[PDB]
Design an enzyme around this catalytic site. Structure first.
Site, PDB file in Angstrom:
ATOM      1  N   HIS B  39       0.809  -1.222   0.000  1.00 56.41           N
ATOM      2  CA  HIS B  39       0.000   0.000   0.000  1.00 56.41           C
ATOM      3  C   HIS B  39       0.830   1.253   0.000  1.00 56.41           C
ATOM      4  O   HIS B  39       0.272   2.349   0.027  1.00 56.41           O
ATOM      5  CB  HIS B  39      -0.982   0.045   1.176  1.00 56.41           C
ATOM      6  CG  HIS B  39      -0.355   0.049   2.540  1.00 56.41           C
ATOM      7  ND1 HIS B  39       0.267   1.154   3.077  1.00 56.41           N
ATOM      8  CD2 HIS B  39      -0.336  -0.896   3.512  1.00 56.41           C
ATOM      9  CE1 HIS B  39       0.670   0.882   4.305  1.00 56.41           C
ATOM     10  NE2 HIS B  39       0.317  -0.356   4.595  1.00 56.41           N
ATOM     11  N   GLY B 141       3.763   6.095  10.609  1.00 53.82           N
ATOM     12  CA  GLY B 141       5.115   5.991  10.107  1.00 53.82           C
ATOM     13  C   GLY B 141       5.839   4.706  10.447  1.00 53.82           C
ATOM     14  O   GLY B 141       6.969   4.509   9.976  1.00 53.82           O
ATOM     15  N   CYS B 143       4.533   1.565   9.800  1.00 56.13           N
ATOM     16  CA  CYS B 143       4.253   0.539   8.795  1.00 56.13           C
ATOM     17  C   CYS B 143       5.542   0.004   8.189  1.00 56.13           C
ATOM     18  O   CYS B 143       6.453   0.769   7.858  1.00 56.13           O
ATOM     19  CB  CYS B 143       3.378   1.101   7.666  1.00 56.13           C
ATOM     20  SG  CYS B 143       1.663   1.362   8.080  1.00 56.13           S
TER      21      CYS B 143
END
Lengths: 300, 299
Positions: B39, B141, B143
């Site tokens: 993503h 932040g 991820c």
């Protein structure tokens, strides 16, 4: 919700841990530049530990009695000296993995990470606070003497603790890196008594402020108290007394929120008398006291 | 007896920053491939019903900025493996450790290196919950942060952070991009099922209390595998299989207490509570220590 007790990444510290051996005792050392730091009781047998004469024992030792081993590379000891309760072993080669570093002595209430080591191999890392009776509650098995405690700035490792002794009560006592013990302890096998452990009041108050910032509020009340009334009650629950210094430190937290400090103290007083009644605060079922104000007003 | 995380040095030097457009997150740099959640190729307006296979056909190599500290990594190729992007880069990571991709089962533990914009900031130990989420501490932040276990010299990578559910829990995939649990990588209403207590990990923690000399919950009674599950189920405690009894073997020999005897203690702890007492300084029963953890930390 959620507030995990996080430890610093240990990478920079792992390449500084080494193995020191003198006669039959082996423990962990700290290799920075061209110096290896380790606890001085490395020069003791188990029979010397009741009444060690450290000066007697050290004058009789030669450079070649100290085996230092950084993995598979064996360092050469070129000299030595004793600073308070720590032994400084000068070696022929500097450690190329030396981070930017500092030595600091901490006060009770402050937190830091511990890199637990066995025979110069890091085995685990955890986060802890210096208790008000100058002890630490961690998991140190035989062979962990010399494990160190640190915080990490932008790039700077601040070393603040080195493990020396296990007390009969199950806790652990140590020095700063200049070899001065925290608290009244000594590197002898005598009967040593840790004082009463108490809850770090200022630490609990900063956590509860982080809770109102993160949505929790069920514990607030409409009351306020004076500093003297609160300490008269907190003492009853083995809570550390609060000082004006503590009040000022919490200032910004009580500025981001609407709640004056002495307000939060009145709420905390009510939590002590009633308990949790099944509910939780930031997903925790107990009052947490190992998150400092600095930590809270930095990672809101 | 503290919850200890593995040392993180071997993982620290594999984290990098991956930017595509406006999104920035963490990536795992092994050999000459960077792994990160797919993503990263989505805009905030694109996460509603993303067509990843269509979205990836538009993108080129020059849409991905990969930073390893102050150095820049040049992407020469890209591919997708279920839910992770694989960015082929031009230089191999000289800090690559001996490593392995494994998938774990709920109840198992591992250490997480929480990162922000390619920079490690913290480490902690957690268990995969039986509902396939982890009670972690990730903010915006983080991820792409990774979970791992360290065999003697070998790092086993078992988790990569993808999403934060609106309850405090976090969800992710293995390094081959297969999700843990019934989640998808879309911004939508997603619910984590009923969490349950990992009964086998509680038992190993009671053995650990007994090793540390705290033996007040011990009683003369014993129970059956079928009677206990009846009380466990009622209190939201995962059923106990015969394999679980077999793993607890080495702790039963060190202490002399049998699994079904110790199970009679746990039964009494749930019905009547702790009577205002502590086990290892706790009023609650810890369920994030596996049996292997207790063998590791104690014997």
């Amino acid at each position: 919700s959620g507030f995990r007790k996080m430890a610093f990444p240990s990478g920079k510290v792992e390449g500084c841990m080494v193995q020191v051996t003198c006669g039959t005792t082996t423990l962990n050392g700290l290799w920075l530049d061209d110096v290896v730091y380790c606890p001085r009781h490395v020069i003791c047998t188990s029979e010397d530990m009741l009444n060690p004469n450290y000066e007697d024992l050290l004058i009789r030792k030669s450079n070649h009695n100290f085996l230092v081993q950084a993995g598979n590379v064996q360092l050469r000891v070129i000299g030595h000296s004793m600073q308070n309760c720590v032994l400084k072993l000068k070696v022929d080669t500097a450690n190329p993995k030396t981070p930017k570093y500092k030595f600091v002595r901490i006060q009770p209430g402050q937190t830091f990470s511990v890199l637990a080591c066995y025979n110069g191999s890091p085995s685990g890392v955890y986060q802890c606070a210096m208790r008000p009776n100058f002890t630490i509650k961690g998991s140190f098995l035989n062979g962990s003497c010399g494990s160190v405690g640190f915080n990490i700035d932008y790039d700077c490792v601040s070393f603040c603790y080195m493990h020396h002794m296990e007390l009969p009560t199950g806790v652990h006592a140590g020095t700063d890196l200049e070899g001065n013990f925290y608290g009244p302890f000594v590197d002898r096998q005598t009967a040593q008594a840790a004082g009463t452990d108490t809850t770090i009041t200022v630490n609990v108050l900063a956590w509860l402020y982080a809770a109102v910032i993160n949505g929790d509020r069920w514990f607030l009340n409409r009351f306020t108290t004076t500093l003297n009334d609160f300490n008269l009650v907190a003492m009853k629950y083995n809570y550390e007394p609060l000082t004006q210094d503590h009040v000022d430190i919490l200032g910004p937290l009580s500025a981001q929120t609407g709640i004056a400090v002495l307000d939060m103290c009145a709420s905390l007083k009510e939590l002590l008398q009633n308990g949790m009644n099944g509910r939780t605060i930031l997903g925790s079922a107990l009052l947490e006291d190992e998150f400092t104000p600095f930590d809270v007003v930095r990672q809101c």
